[PDB]
Design a protein around this ligand. Structure first.
Ligand SMILES: NC(=O)c1ccc[n+]([C@@H]2O[C@H](COP(=O)([O-])OP(=O)(O)OC[C@H]3O[C@@H](n4cnc5c(N)ncnc54)[C@H](OP(=O)(O)O)[C@@H]3O)[C@@H](O)[C@H]2O)c1
Ligand SMILES: NC(=O)c1ccc[n+]([C@@H]2O[C@H](COP(=O)([O-])OP(=O)(O)OC[C@H]3O[C@@H](n4cnc5c(N)ncnc54)[C@H](OP(=O)(O)O)[C@@H]3O)[C@@H](O)[C@H]2O)c1
Ligand SMILES: NC(=O)c1ccc[n+]([C@@H]2O[C@H](COP(=O)([O-])OP(=O)(O)OC[C@H]3O[C@@H](n4cnc5c(N)ncnc54)[C@H](OP(=O)(O)O)[C@@H]3O)[C@@H](O)[C@H]2O)c1
Ligand SMILES: NC(=O)c1ccc[n+]([C@@H]2O[C@H](COP(=O)([O-])OP(=O)(O)OC[C@H]3O[C@@H](n4cnc5c(N)ncnc54)[C@H](OP(=O)(O)O)[C@@H]3O)[C@@H](O)[C@H]2O)c1
Ligand SMILES: Nc1nc2ccc(C(=O)NC(c3ccccc3)c3ccccc3)cc2s1
Ligand SMILES: Nc1nc2ccc(C(=O)NC(c3ccccc3)c3ccccc3)cc2s1
Ligand SMILES: Nc1nc2ccc(C(=O)NC(c3ccccc3)c3ccccc3)cc2s1
Lengths: 250, 251, 252, 253
């Protein structure tokens, strides 16, 4: 009776907040993770303490390779194995780091990681979700700043642009199956763990609405809306949740 | 105690559905109308039967003129008079008709209606709303998902709707320091113009990827409800398409 | 009779003059429209006529919206036919630009008439008159703004007018395509800074431009107009070319 | 050594050929990159060298993504410096295009490698190699984009993803390379040269959708926009994508 959702990169930060809010809404959840095993298992424990048998973890590397289609099929299969259905896919997992055009990872590894996590894995996950098929939908975590990108982040930005293309192409192609495909695009939300406080404050000061970053819960709220019955005519839409950041000129 | 909302063009169709759903969410509402007095009062009666003294009507022509600024100030003022506050402005009223570039309203009348109602009145209402201002204050503008693939011979209408996107962005930036969010909802085909023939209505319905049907007014209202809610408190300057995928469909 | 002819609105100075000059150098006869800048307009027409006799005229009009604006726009197009017997190109360059804050000597209705009139309604009415007068490589070029999605604070009416001009560009490209009239736009970021602006403030904006940390010259903007009216753009309609040195790509 | 030089990928046929011809007519020396079309690439180089000796060479490479793609792309740029002593212009034109339906003899990872490699990864690697070699002059890159990226063909998700990635590259590289004086722009066709084997009755279905003339763009019309973007008339233009689509993208369903 309860619907089920897969959330990628769900052990921490925004993906954790999405998994938590879906669970609070009544979903059973697959918490996908790559390296954060302890955090993933800890979240599943918390959710299961709340309602038994409503959360599982599923480990996978979402870097592009010739076995990525199998890994993505397994993530979807894990939801059917645990819960007998898969109603919602949230493509949240993402690699993010600079790749300067002018000069420990080879460039082909950087392509595989940045384009794999942000674009190819979402595509393969979408394929597997659709092939295995109420209120079915997919939500892709996009980036409100894709047209005003950070300096030296070309591969990341290429991946996020590709994810916009996937959102639109899959919304078109999956509409006759009743599957909606939409996006949520943060501006600045939870800042990278590696970033110093002074730099975090630099970015906070740029946001018109409150001079602060989005909480993870604020991003999750837009995901909840798009999967809800209140969004049943919405497909191919990307909702910015950016406090007006993308409207601010240089 | 209860927040209050102004909805322009609220007597019928999409504006009515928005007013109904805001009311159901707990708002007190000003139902603005131009020509549709009977329908406006009928809605106010229905809402007041549910919760007494929670719905008022306000007449105004939203055509651009020397008096449009005073009329817009009165709409906002009516909310403050009735309810003591104005938390939400929904710019829903619109005129829609063709204005061919190559050839009984003069062109400058068409300007005053299409650009006035669809862009200048939202601008003046936004000024009045902001001037009169914990809280969750926002404005929602009814945009058009087809603004970049416009209907043939609708240049003035399309100009007004593009101007409304500009207002949404400019006002979101300028009002963010006041905690006033400014967002849009962009329908594709929703309730077809009453004048449109049944065969032409079906032609459009058949192009929509999602179920080959128009949006109900209630689906449009659901997006408005989200944007005014606490679930959207970091969202400003965003326009949510509610179009069943229609804008994605090539020629 | 066989050199083509162009109307350039707001052509006495700055970008509009550069467009008129470059069109003239390409072989066009030109109508130099102007509002207040009579001395500068006549001085330009005299220069162009010295270079080739009877190839430049001036035409005065206020492009503020009013119930007479349609007649004024009809008259601008008529001046081109009166002088040159044809009108091949329309460049909508004239523009009012000033802040209109949402929270507090012109009335708001004057500000609406000026900012929306010059930037949007006059281009629309000129587009109507241009199209209706037609009997070649016919086109319209609208001067847009690369920063319309990242607008200056407190410029809502200006930004509304430039957004409306994008809508006109696309609507008119669609509707006039059957008549062989192409309709395109050129969108500067920062080009010639306002005459009233001090050097320090100019340098603040210059420093934001990735390509050279400098504003576009007037000639650089005119170069993109010249391309869009040329035979090298015969399949281009409904396109807006940014000429902004990357400015619109730069985040906050 | 005074004439500038350009690399054009996928230049043996169709749009890339017309770009290579127009660049040569403008005074550029050209590297004609090709993958499978050797005879046509060599025929073009010989035609161009007959017009002006030692102004055209060919360079073969597969632009599918793989472990060797970065080296291949470095080699393409290197070929221009070895032939002509300079590389002023890069045109990323080569492209794979075919449907990849989401719902059900190439594996899906081959389709990823081909559609994302040709349309996006190879342009990125070529852009890296071009810039690293440059770390009077008018250096620029032109990417062949697609005016219909937001109204895509049904069941072309991987192709559309690659073309959206190419918009991202055009913008990100324009920003990052602007300090080096390298401009980065795009030209976005709607419908241009159709497949010759496509029935005329199907070609006409697409032609009739185009507002401006109810016909597809010639390859030369697309090349004309590339020529403008590399020219001295575009020296303040970077990060711009010029649609050359006859109004097709403005037409609703
Ligand atoms: N935070 C922001 O300000 C912001 C702004 C714009 C867009 N976004 C988007 O919003 C989403 C969530 O942002 P976030 O900051 O929460 O993300 P994040 O913490 O940077 O990354 C989310 C998770 O992605 C997973 N991931 C990384 N590489 C992976 C790989 N090779 N295989 C599988 N999983 C991998 C990691 O899982 P493990 O920890 O299990 O390894 C990581 O915890 C992302 O798509 C992001 O691009 C965020
Ligand atoms: N229906 C769709 O499929 C669709 C598609 C795209 C966008 N939209 C947008 O969605 C919104 C609502 O659409 P709708 O179809 O419900 O609108 P609508 O029925 O065409 O008109 C809404 C109301 O606007 C008011 N109005 C018109 N001209 C006016 C004037 N000069 N002064 C004051 N009020 C005036 C009218 O109120 P009175 O009846 O009181 O005179 C009318 O009932 C509009 O902004 C529209 O552009 C709708
Ligand atoms: N300069 C920039 O950095 C920049 C940036 C973005 C966009 N643009 C766009 O590029 C175009 C050219 O810019 P610019 O800086 O050269 O323009 P500008 O000097 O600010 O204005 C050009 C002309 O507009 C005419 N104008 C103003 N109000 C008018 C009215 N009520 N009626 C008729 N004409 C009127 C004036 O003519 P008179 O002098 O004869 O009165 C003025 O000379 C404009 O459309 C502008 O918005 C420029
Ligand atoms: N034609 C149109 O209507 C249209 C519409 C929109 C966008 N565009 C864009 O405009 C550009 C030119 O279009 P077009 O129709 O002339 O392209 P095309 O004929 O489909 O392809 C151009 C060339 O790409 C090369 N290519 C394909 N796969 C390759 C690989 N794996 N490695 C290396 N090279 C490869 C081929 O070279 P070989 O022949 O040597 O193997 C082919 O001749 C493309 O980027 C396209 O996406 C075209
Ligand atoms: N998986 C992840 N994706 C992203 C995407 C963006 C951000 C974020 O921090 N963006 C900031 C920023 C990025 C790099 C360096 C400094 C700040 C940002 C993005 C656009 C404008 C301003 C700040 C952080 C993450 S984490
Ligand atoms: N008719 C005219 N239209 C315009 C449009 C824009 C500008 C211009 O100066 N834009 C600047 C700027 C505007 C206001 C205050 C300071 C600087 C600009 C625009 C966008 C981003 C950064 C700077 C100047 C003019 S003059
Ligand atoms: N390397 C290449 N890239 C592209 C991109 C697009 C096209 C093209 O022909 N597009 C047509 C079309 C696509 C599929 C079937 C028939 C026609 C097109 C594209 C967008 C909307 C309508 C038609 C052809 C090519 S060839």
């Amino acid at each position: 009776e309860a619907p089920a959702a897969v959330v990628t990169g769900a052990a921490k930060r925004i993906g954790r907040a999405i998994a938590v809010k879906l669970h609070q809404t009544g979903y059973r959840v697959v918490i996908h993770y790559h390296n954060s095993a302890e955090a993933a298992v800890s979240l599943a424990d918390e959710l299961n303490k709340e309602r038994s048998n409503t959360a599982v973890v599923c480990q996978a590397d979402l870097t592009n390779s010739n076995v990525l289609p199998a890994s993505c099929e397994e993530i979807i299969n894990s939801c059917f194995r645990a819960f007998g259905r898969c109603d919602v896919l949230v493509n949240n997992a993402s690699a993010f780091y600079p790749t300067p055009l002018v000069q420990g990872k080879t460039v082909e590894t950087q392509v595989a990681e940045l384009i794999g996590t942000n674009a190819i894995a979402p595509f393969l996950l979408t394929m597997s979700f659709a092939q295995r098929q109420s209120n079915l939908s997919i939500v892709n975590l996009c980036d409100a700043m894709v047209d005003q990108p950070c300096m030296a982040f070309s591969l990341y930005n290429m991946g996020k642009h590709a994810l916009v293309g996937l959102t639109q192409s899959a919304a078109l192609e999956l509409a006759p199956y009743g599957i909606r495909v939409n996006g949520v695009a943060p501006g600045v939300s939870l800042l990278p763990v590696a970033m110093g406080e002074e730099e975090k404050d630099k970015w906070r000061r740029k946001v018109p609405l409150g001079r602060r970053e989005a909480s993870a819960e604020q991003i999750a709220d837009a995901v909840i809306f798009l999967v809800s019955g209140s969004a049943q005519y919405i497909t191919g839409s990307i909702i910015k949740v950016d406090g007006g950041l993308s409207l601010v000129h240089a």
